[PDB]
Design a protein around this ligand. Structure first.
Ligand code: 0B7
Ligand code: 0B7
Ligand code: 0B7
Ligand code: 0B7
Ligand code: MG
Ligand code: MG
Ligand code: MG
Ligand code: MG
Lengths: 5, 224, 224, 5
């Protein structure tokens, strides 16, 4: 899952 | 080590290290700046966050490669433990800065939310390698939840720190807390509330907000 | 630090570090292995080379960013000097391993050529940041030239170490030695001689050789 | 200029 980059 | 360098020089060198993709240097410079004892500006908080996110990100990616090798199959275990210990030390360093004394000295809602989000993130990283693990999950959840409560009271639904917080809290729920429906509900309500607020934004603020909303949508797509 | 670890474990951990893209660890493991005092196998030489090429490569790229910032315009100078000093220390470490005692103990032509190529490469990296600079350029040229002489006597024109040597020597001539016609002549004759030899190769050897020939052609294209 | 990768 993508998190804040 | 950075105690003899001026605060301003440490900040300038952190910016140079970012341009040089020297993230370990960057983090050491920003640690030095934090330890001068003065509160951090918005730009300085972002520098701190970017530095340690990249350092710990490289460690997490290494740890995942080694853990996957370890499971297929003493050297692999020994080297995963070594990487794991280094990652825990970096997380302990960040949490140490937050607790001595960034959080307590954060008067403003936006500063305090930023630091509480970071606290959740670095407990989250600790939780990924933990097995006690339960205590770490609870510490992350509580930091995230206190940031959410302040953010909902003090910031609009499109604020990029509030959106980035909600993004990462939703990932926590899905990846760490085995609460995928909580993750989906949080991402969806966050996305819809920001959507209904875009009409108030400038072209610049609009770009900030819709960038993070896209991450929320991507996760909802992978999760459902 | 690696003196208490078995040679075999250091090699295994170097391979794991490569998979984890932990190149500083990889280099420390391969340094440990070298210092056990036994000659290195072909695969071990490649591990040594890959580890330090990536470490020094990250340093060189950082140094170039900072040097370009420095020239447009004390912090930038100070931080470039710091990176520069770290890069010199890594090069000194590699050259130390080659001189104590990889080269002198390299009986075989292929081992000795591999190590002499490395010696040229790490003097070349030193030359890029030097200003004495003349001595370093001469040390690189002599190491490269001794490797060429052995390689021409002992290896076929398609051998990947001989081709990689000729590639890097040609880059030395063009980028360091201000001898662009020497660079072009070396790349061209190397390419033509390997071309005329491809008919002798297996499908595997053919793939090794034509990969490096493509690099030679790319440079000839940029240089003329 | 490209060197041996
Ligand atoms: N040096 C840095 N890394 C930053 C300095 C400042 C800053 C500078 C001056 C005043 C206030 C803040 C930052 C504020 N963040 C962004 O603009 C941002 C964040 C994430 C993404 C992803 C794609 N684009 C993005 C832009 S980031
Ligand atoms: N109240 C606001 N909306 C902001 C005030 C300031 C500010 C405050 C003081 C000085 C200068 C600028 C902002 C600077 N941008 C960010 O922090 C930021 C952080 C993360 C992301 C991800 C996508 N975009 C991002 C922007 S945003
Ligand atoms: N672990 C490593 N990094 C290597 C181990 C061995 C090895 C393993 C067993 C016996 C002998 C040598 C290597 C020999 N080099 C290559 O095959 C090679 C080199 C460059 C390129 C560029 C694209 N493809 C390439 C392949 S590299
Ligand atoms: N005499 C030869 N032609 C070889 C003998 C062995 C060997 C020796 C002992 C054990 C196993 C294999 C080779 C293994 N490959 C390499 O070293 C190599 C290095 C760099 C590159 C770049 C593209 N391809 C590459 C291949 S090449
Ligand atoms: Mg001062
Ligand atoms: Mg305060
Ligand atoms: Mg032993
Ligand atoms: Mg020998």
């Amino acid at each position: 899952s993508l998190s804040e980059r | 080590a950075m105690g003899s360098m001026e605060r301003a020089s440490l900040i300038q060198k952190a910016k140079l290290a970012e341009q040089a993709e020297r993230y370990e240097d960057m983090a050491a410079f920003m640690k030095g700046a934090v330890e001068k004892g003065e509160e951090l500006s918005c730009e300085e908080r972002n520098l701190l966050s970017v530095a340690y996110k990249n350092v710990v990100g490289g460690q997490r990616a290494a740890w995942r490669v080694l853990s996957s090798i370890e499971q297929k199959s003493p050297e692999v275990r020994e080297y995963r433990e070594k990487v794991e210990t280094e990652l825990q030390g970096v997380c302990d360093t960040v949490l140490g800065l937050l607790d001595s004394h960034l959080i307590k000295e954060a008067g403003d809602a936006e500063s305090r939310v930023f630091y509480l989000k970071m606290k959740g993130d670095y407990y989250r990283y600790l939780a990924e390698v933990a097995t006690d693990k339960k205590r770490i999950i609870d510490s992350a959840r509580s930091a995230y939840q206190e940031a959410m409560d302040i953010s909902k009271k003090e910031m609009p639904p499109t604020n990029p720190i509030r959106l980035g917080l909600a993004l990462n809290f939703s990932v926590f729920h899905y990846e760490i807390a085995n609460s995928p429906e909580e993750a989906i509900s949080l991402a969806k309500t966050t996305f819809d509330e920001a959507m209904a607020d875009l009409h108030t934004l400038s072209e610049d603020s609009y770009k900030d907000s819709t960038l993070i909303m896209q991450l929320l949508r991507d996760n909802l797509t992978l999760w459902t």
